[PDB]
Design a protein around this ligand. Structure first.
Ligand SMILES: OC[C@H]1O[C@H](OC[C@H]2O[C@@H](O)[C@@H](O)[C@@H](O)[C@@H]2O)[C@H](O)[C@@H](O)[C@H]1O
Ligand code: CA
Length: 139
């Protein structure tokens, strides 16, 4: 299934205002990463757009090099409300992701979502180098 496109959404700003914003997780470079402005609460994802819903069949991600531990416990969610109050967890990261590569995980949830995100665990500053969603328009 193809890589899904959308509008990047999530935590605004970056650590020490250096500029490593959420957009660095979608730029195709595994060397660039999102470094959030706070230790906790950081998240990033996509809005596929009004009236657009995709079924998610796979997620790929790559940790920030040297900070792979900061992804453990992170979750990926799908939702149809931008505040994620109706979210369901699509996958939970429970082991250390390999450095410098995209780890691919299958998703088995038939629901169509307008919104998807990665919700980072405490102490991570949202650290992630790259994030990709795959799937198909909801029937
Ligand atoms: O705390 C978030 C922060 O963690 C690392 O930096 C930790 C500290 O490193 C030190 O060398 C000092 O620069 C100190 O100011 C830092 O808090 C990451 O390298 C950084 O990007 C950021 O994620
Ligand atoms: Ca990147």
């Amino acid at each position: 299934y193809p890589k899904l496109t959308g509008t990047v959404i999530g935590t605004q700003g970056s650590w020490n205002n250096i500029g490593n914003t959420i957009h660095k997780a979608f730029d195709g470079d595994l060397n660039t990463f999102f470094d959030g402005p706070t230790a906790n609460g950081c998240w990033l994802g996509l809005d596929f757009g009004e009236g657009v819903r995709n079924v998610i069949t796979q997620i790929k991600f790559c940790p920030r090099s040297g900070y792979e531990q900061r992804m453990i416990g992170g979750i990926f969610q799908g939702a149809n409300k931008e505040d994620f109050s109706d979210a369901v967890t699509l996958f939970t990261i429970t082991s250390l992701p390999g450095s410098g590569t995209l780890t691919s995980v299958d998703v088995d949830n038939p629901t169509g979502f307008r919104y998807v995100r990665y919700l980072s665990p405490d102490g991570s500053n949202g650290n992630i180098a790259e994030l990709q969603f795959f799937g198909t328009p909801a029937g």
